[PDB]
Amino acid sequence: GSIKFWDFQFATLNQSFKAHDADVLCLTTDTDNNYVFSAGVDRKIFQFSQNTNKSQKNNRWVNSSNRLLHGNDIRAICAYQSKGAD
Amino acid sequence: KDANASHPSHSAIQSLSFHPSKPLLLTGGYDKTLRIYHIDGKTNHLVTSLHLVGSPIQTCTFYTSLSNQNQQNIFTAGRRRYMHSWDLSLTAKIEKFSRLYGHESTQRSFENFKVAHLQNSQTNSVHGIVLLQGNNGWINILHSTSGLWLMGCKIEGVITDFCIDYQPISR
Amino acid sequence: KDLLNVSWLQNATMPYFKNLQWREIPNEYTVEISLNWNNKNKSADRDLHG
Amino acid sequence: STARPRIITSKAPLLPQQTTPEQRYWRQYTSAQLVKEHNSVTHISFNPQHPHDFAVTSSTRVQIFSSRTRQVIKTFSRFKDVVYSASFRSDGKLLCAGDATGLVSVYDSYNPRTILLSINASTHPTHVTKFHTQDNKILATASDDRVTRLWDISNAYEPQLELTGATDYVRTLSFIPAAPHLVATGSYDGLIRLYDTRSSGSTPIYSLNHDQPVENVIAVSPTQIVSCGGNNFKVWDLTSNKKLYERGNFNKAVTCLDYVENFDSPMQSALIASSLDGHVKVFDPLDNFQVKFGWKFSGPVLSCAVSPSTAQGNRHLVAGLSSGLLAIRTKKKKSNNFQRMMRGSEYQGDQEHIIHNDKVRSQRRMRAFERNINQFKWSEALDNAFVPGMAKELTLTVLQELRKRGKVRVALYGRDESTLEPLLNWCLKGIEDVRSASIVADWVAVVLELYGNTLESSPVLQELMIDLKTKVRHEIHKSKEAQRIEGMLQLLT
Amino acid sequence: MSLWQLETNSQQFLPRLNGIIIDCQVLGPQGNYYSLILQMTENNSNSDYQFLLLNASDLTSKLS
RNA sequence: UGCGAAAGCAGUUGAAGACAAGUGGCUUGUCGUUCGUUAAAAUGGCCUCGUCAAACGGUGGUACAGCGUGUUUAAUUGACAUGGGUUGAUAACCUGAACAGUCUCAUCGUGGC
């Protein structure tokens, strides 16, 4: 259930969140990577946000929100974001 | 003269630290007691001696803050899920750190710690941090007065040791 | 005159003192001091049962 | 902040006939052994000194049993007629046995082949032989000659004292446990005589009139002695020549007594009594010789004993029956380099100035219902109630904790047919008891309040409700007729 | 009294505080004490407040 | 709400104003608004500080249950390096200064394992 963010160069963890209660099957992001959405077998969709200017200048995601919308699982998640569609 | 010759130790001496200012030497080992010796040349005597029951100690450190240099804590810890902190006052007021603030799975033993100084970098306020070496690659850094988990640093592999470097920036 | 101040070291190097009216004590006088030997660390913020 | 209070197990008002500490201690004498003897077990003595062996006198043999294996370690079979009494000396070193031909033979214990001396007492059968309890070298033998004799075991030719005076069949001796000059003897005419041995000795100093023919006399204090004979036993203060208790709690004649002091027990002293009808009972000398526990055996019990005061091991109660068998009930009781590396772990702060202690004590393990009530899993706590291996007071206390604490309805919300049947199937059993039936009443009332439609659908809990109806019908007939008995003795005030 | 680690949203609790917390605040320069006001509302006939600071190290009630 | 006993016995539930929604009004509903009357819901639940084993003393119903043995009327001792790593879908295995004073081990011989 843990969701981790890793610096690519230096190949190493920046921060770990203990978000879900069971596996995280699928996670996705938006265009400018201000949000990361994530979901799995415990059937909640978590949202990790970095939209604040301090968040962007400090590289610090926060565990922003959490929604319970699905009945059994979430096995697939995806995002689209355009001028008249997000 | 052998420093603990005045009062013998009942175990192998696992850690050993001088005071930053005073002529004091703190020894400690697996017989779960820690002894302070006023050292000099001739007669290294025993200042005081504290026996923590059920808590063999493996690392013991004199911490002395940078703000007022008047705290004089002793942080001590062994293969336990807690770490003691004696506040030196010459009864003895010691506190126990036993809460990783959400991070108990990655820190199952407080053996390998180190104490260091940290600056707030928006105020010029320093405070001591203790740094615990945990299981996966984890170093859990936490406040030396409140015990609050400040941050954690994970390396990739089997963490074996670590050290603290400082570098000045300005006045 | 009638007053005697003796000195010892309580911890390793810190001197402690005692005043005595030496004219009215007995000949073989044994001063008793309270000194930590095995005392359970009674913290003031906790009762005896922990 | 505090620690969490433990879930208190629901204790009701206590019912009559609770388990006393005396009867808990005397009830853990178990694992009975029945050893069939050749004839009726008449006497049984214990070794005093290493108080760990006992001699059983059957007919024409005396067997020493061990108090750790309960088998015959050693046996004494070279008697010509029926051997009657067999006791150990106070040092536990040698063993005297009176025989039906009036030949006291004393061997040494733990060596049946060396008969040490054979006192030729009266031509009549010698029925009781015991050494002095203070002195070591005098042996008191009474016989069917109506005269007891004190023998010095050095001069074993003439008796050093001849205590006569009794009119019929002296069957018991006893010595008084602080004054060593004082021998209390008991005969089949009643009349416990007792003798000062510095005097003539042909006359008792006084006599205690037990009215029945006495079977045994033992000494409890240095002052008071207890004589059994007939259906009762009486106790006698000896400094004042005067009876002060009598207990007649048997059907037939009390055959024997013995007494225990200072042993590891809630009872500080204990007199046990064996009484020809099957019963051996234990009486407590400190509250007025009241009976505290008893055993019933498969025939008339002829003699009994217990392990002595300093037994230090496997402790025994033995009773030999007139049927010819013997019943025993017992209560039982890395590298030098690595150690040099891990040396200090056993030090515990002796020479150290301050000694800090904040290791918390480890409490009892929480059961699953208690940790589920702690974790606020209230339906899981109900499920953990109705497992099969649960105590009835434990099911009751988790029902009562869910009743007082939160909501019966919360604990019962998500249920259906298959998950209510444990509750109602326990409520059948709990409706009978007084202590459970209030809780069973409101739990059944709530579950039929909020599952009245599942009543319609499922037929396989309709029948459970019908069985519950007949249960409450039986219980309401019982609770009505109890009120009728209550009135019918309210009439008799 | 819960304290939320706002980085990982991780609670540390202190659960049985003989009164509801109607005020809580950090107190020291380094934040080594928490001061709390506990309203103790089992009696409805009076508003009886307990003042409880506690050291933040081992979360023990220093000076209630 | 009042009088009460723990049963019960008498009383109910108005008005103003503002705002919100729906279709300037009309309807409905609210109020960190006033006057008068004795008058269900935001997936959102409780910390670590050492476990395990075996006893013992009381207490309930002796395998059952519970409290205690830090001082108490009474009654407790012992194991464990309270870690790290690899599998494991609890365990096994590896590992940290883990053979060796009653010195341990190797090798070549001598005499009788």
CB A70 within 8 A of CB A45: yes
Residue of D nearest to E53 (CA): D1
Give the tokens for residue B68: 């007022």
Nucleotide nearest to B136 (CA to C1'): F84
| Beta strand extents in D215-372 (DSSP E only) | 216-219, 224-229, 232-237, 242-247, 256-261, 269-274, 279-284, 290-296, 301-306, 315-321, 325-331, 354-356
CB D115 within 8 A of CB D96: no
CB D221 within 8 A of CB D240: no
Dump the DSSP string for B72-118.
-EEEEE-SSS-EEEEEP-----EEEE---SS--TT-----SEEEEEE
What is each CA distance from C7 to B39, C30, D47, in whole angstroms? 21, 14, 67
Give the tokens for residue D306: 């217990």
Q: Gap from D347 CA to F105 C1', in Å?
A: 34
- How far is CA D227 from its chain centroid? 21
Q: Gap from A67 CA to F23 C1', in Å?
A: 36
Distance, in Å, from the CA atom of B50 to the CA atom of B14, rounded to the nearest integer, reads 16
CB D193 within 8 A of CB D225: no
Distance, in Å, from the CA atom of A10 to the CA atom of A25, rounded to the nearest integer, reads 26
Distance, in Å, from the CA atom of B37 to the CA atom of A52, rounded to the nearest integer, reads 54
- How far is CA E23 from its chain centroid? 8
Please list the alpha-helical segments (H only) found in D342-436: 368-374, 378-385, 392-405, 408-412, 421-430
CA neighbor of B136 nearest in space, from B160, B113, B120, B117: B160
Contacts of D198 (CB under 8 A, 6+ apart): D181
Distance, in Å, from the CA atom of D180 to the CA atom of D164, rounded to the nearest integer, reads 19
The residue type at B139: I
CB A43 within 8 A of CB A68: yes
Length of chain E: 64
Q: E38 in the Ramachandran plot: left (φ > 0), alpha (ψ -120 to 50) or beta?
A: beta
Distance, in Å, from the CA atom of D386 to the CA atom of D423, rounded to the nearest integer, reads 7
Whether C46 sits inside 8 A of E62 (CB atoms) is no
What is each CA distance from A36 to A8, A51, A62, A68, A72, in whole angstroms? 17, 11, 10, 16, 21
CA neighbor of D401 nearest in space, from D377, D427, D418: D377
Residue of B nearest to A11 (CA): B156
CB B125 within 8 A of CB B118: no
CB D301 within 8 A of CB D280: yes
What is each CA distance from D337 to B9, B29, B32, B124, D222, in whole angstroms? 18, 17, 20, 51, 61
CA neighbor of D143 nearest in space, from D176, D166, D115, D160: D166
Contact positions of strand F to protein Cβ (< 7 A): 43-53, 55-62, 64-70, 80-85, 97-101
Eight-state DSSP code of residue A85: B
Distance, in Å, from the CA atom of D322 to the CA atom of D301, rounded to the nearest integer, reads 6
Give the tokens for residue B19: 């005071």
Q: Gap from A34 CA to F21 C1', in Å?
A: 36
CB B56 within 8 A of CB B62: no
- How do D354-356 and B45-52 pair as beta strands? parallel
- How do E3-5 and E10-12 pair as beta strands? antiparallel
Q: Which 4-63 residues of chain E touch chain C by CB within 8 A?
A: 60-63
CA neighbor of B88 nearest in space, from B101, B72, B76: B72
Nearest beta carbon to residue C41 from set D354, D360, D361: D354
Distance, in Å, from the CA atom of D278 to the CA atom of D441, rounded to the nearest integer, reads 47
Q: What sign does the dihedral D318-D323-D325-D329 (CA atoms) show?
A: negative
Phi, psi angle pair for D241, to nearest 5°: 65, 30
CA of D370 vs chain C CAs: smallest distance (Å): 24
- How do C39-40 and D354-356 pair as beta strands? parallel
Contacts of D151 (CB under 8 A, 6+ apart): D104, D119, D138, D139, D140, D141, D159, D160
Q: Residue for token digits 């009808």?
A: D277
Length of chain D: 493
Nearest beta carbon to residue B156 from set A11, A16, A18: A11
CB-neighbour burial class of residue B88 (10 A; exposed 0-12, middle 13-18, buried 19+): buried
Helix, strand, coil shares of chain D, percent, nearest 5, are: 20, 35, 45
3-state secondary structure D467-492: HHHHHHHHHHHHHHHHHHHHHHHHCC
CA neighbor of B79 nearest in space, from B35, B112, B114, B116: B112
Distance, in Å, from the CA atom of B167 to the CA atom of D237, rounded to the nearest integer, reads 96
Distance, in Å, from the CA atom of B91 to the CA atom of B110, rounded to the nearest integer, reads 25
Interface present between B and D (3 or more CB pairs within 8 Å): yes
Nearest beta carbon to residue C41 from set D350, D356, D360: D356
Q: Residue for token digits 């019963």?
A: D279
Distance, in Å, from the CA atom of C12 to the CA atom of D440, rounded to the nearest integer, reads 72
Find the largest Cα–Cα distance for chain B: 50
CA neighbor of D30 nearest in space, from D362, D391, D316: D316
